[PDB]
Structure 1
Amino acid sequence: EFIIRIPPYHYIHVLDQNSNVSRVEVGPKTYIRQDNERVLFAPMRMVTVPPRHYCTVANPVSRDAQGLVLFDVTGQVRLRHADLEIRLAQDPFPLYPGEVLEKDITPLQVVLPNTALHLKALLDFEDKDGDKVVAGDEWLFEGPGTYIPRKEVEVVEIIQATIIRQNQALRLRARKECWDRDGKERVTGEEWLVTTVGAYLPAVFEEVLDLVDAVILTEKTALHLRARRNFRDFRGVSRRTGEEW
């Protein structure tokens, strides 16, 4: 019981009963406990995360400007209560006392091409771009690359672009006062059309409803249209509600 040699790449926690302070010991070394000091459990492997992976541990380690672990006056480890940290690939760090491995070793999510990630800013922060990302903001991250996670940014859902072929259009309404890709203001619930051929990626506030296909006008046929409100058609003539042509 007194003699405890932990295997290489492992650790144990021994409590200083004369100070009620717990500590972790690492390295392939032989360890002998004192009479007052008591180990809490047998050695278990100190965890490493492989490349393209990440893990989250609650109550992250409070560190200085050089990343050296700060220690309390009573010999305790300085933590950050009720916080989560994202750890990417590095050496097999040990788990300090007072920390919980909430999420296991998880791979980095890869975004397929013509696909986008919907992200919501949980808490107010400042992104690396240089913008004050207020809490509740919506994010549209797209591309064939991979997304590195974050504590204060939550993924909402994975969204897929819509293919617009020849002689077609897409109907998408605004979920909120916003601007379209053409630079026009859109009120809540307002609907419009987009006539760009190819894969079209919906925005965060633009609910995509259905695809609209053009009507082929042969010399023996014509199209009967009644205006729904005052507007200007493609030829450039104003209309009135209920008017037909």
Structure 2
Amino acid sequence: EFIIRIPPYHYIHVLDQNSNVSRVEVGPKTYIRQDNERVLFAPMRMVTVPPRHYCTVANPVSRDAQGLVLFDVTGQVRLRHADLEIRLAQDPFPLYPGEVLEKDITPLQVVLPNTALHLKALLDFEDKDGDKVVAGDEWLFEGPGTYIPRKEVEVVEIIQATIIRQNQALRLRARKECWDRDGKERVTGEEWLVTTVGAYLPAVFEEVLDLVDAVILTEKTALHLRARRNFRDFRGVSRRTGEEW
């Protein structure tokens, strides 16, 4: 149990009981241990993440400007505690001591056309575009692209588009005080209708209620309407609460 052969693309961890500092032995080697040392476990293949895939390793090692691993003065590997890393496709890295595999190799999930991902920031951070994204903000990553996960950013759900045909309105009610595509104030609880034909993605703060189709008018027909509140109609004529036309 002193001589131990590590296949190519594998590793082990051995602890030196003089300083009680641990390390990793990587490579295609035949390994010879001392008597003061102990090998921790039986050889494990160093994990490989294919292209268009992903993994999260809890408590990543620290790095320098070149990206090299940092050790302690005692010889122990430098870690980052209660912290995670974003590991995309690369060469078969080994896991060091005190490195945990949080999520296995998983497939990067691709966003379909006419849909969007609802992503909220868990912890504050700085944005790719130069912005500061305070924790608790709401986004939409939409389009047909691929989404690369982040640590402090969590995906809440995916939202489909709703289809608006000709002569329809699709009423929307606000989750909170907000703004709208048409560029005008909305408040909590207020409702409105977005006429535009096509497919529609609601914002994070907007919600879809129901589709409302037009009433068709002829020479033998009219439409009896009552005002919910004071407003202006499409003729531009003013309407007080309650009055009918």
TM-score interval (norm. to shorter): over 0.9
1:151-201 Cα deviation digits (max 9, x unpaired) = 000000011011100111111111111100000110001000000000000
Structure 2 runs not aligned, ≥5 long: none
Paired residues, number: 245
The Cα RMSD (Å) is 0.6
Partner deviation per Cα, 1:2-46 (whole Å, 9 max, x = no partner):
001100000000000111111001110111111010001110100
| Whole-Å separation in 1 of the counterparts to 2:16 and 2:189 | 64
Percent same amino acid among aligned pairs? 100
Q: 1:61: Cα distance to partner?
A: 1.3
Paired position in structure 1 for 2:117? 117
- Map Cα deviations across residues 124-146 of structure 1 (whole Å, 9 max, x no partner): 00011111100000011101111
Structure 1 position 242, deviation (Å) = 0.3
Secondary structure of residue in 2 paired with 1:168? coil
Cα distance in 2 for residues equivalent to 1:20 and 1:233:
81
Q: Distance in 2 between matches of 1:164 and 1:118?
A: 22
Structure 1 partner of 2:213: 213
Alignment partner of 1:146: what SS?
coil
Structure 1 position 78 matched with structure 2 position 61: no
Residue in 2 aligned with 1:9? 9
> Which position in structure 1 is the counterpart of 2:106?
106
**Runs of at least 4 residues of structure 1 off by over 3 A?**
none
Q: State the shift of 1:67 in Å.
A: 0.3
State the 1:207 CA deviation: 1.1
Give the drift of 1:102: 1.4
CA deviation profile, 1:38-94 (whole Å, cap 9, x unmatched):
001110100010000000010011101110001111001111000111100000000
* Partner Cα distance (1:201, 1:159) in 2: 7
Partner Cα separation in structure 2 for residue 238 and residue 60 of structure 1? 65
Cα separation, 2, equivalents of 1:160 and 1:166: 20
Once residues 218 and 43 of structure 1 are traced to their aligned partners in structure 2, the CA distance between those partners, rounded to angstroms, is 82
TM-score (norm: length of structure 1):
0.99
| Matched residue, 2:202 | 202
Question: Residue deviations 1:84-116, cap 9 Å, x none?
Answer: 111000000000100111111000011110000
What is the Cα deviation at residue 241 of structure 1? 0.4
Superposition map of 1:36-185 within 5 A: 36-185=36-185
Partner Cα distance (2:150, 2:85) in 1: 8
Distance 2:127 2:108 in 1: 20
- Structure 1 stretches lacking a partner, 5+ long: none
Structure with bigger strand share is: 1
Q: Secondary structure at the match of 2:169?
A: strand
Cα distance in structure 1, aligned partners of 2:80 and 2:151 = 13
What's the TM-score, normalizing by structure 2? 0.99
Q: Secondary structure at the match of 2:57?
A: strand
SS of residue in 2 equivalent to 1:196? coil
Please give the alpha-carbon distance, in whole angstroms, between the structure 2 residues aligned to 1:179 and 1:223.
Answer: 32
**C-alpha distance in 2, partners of 1:134/1:53?**
28
User: How far apart are the structure 1 equivalents of 2:211 and 2:164?
Assistant: 8
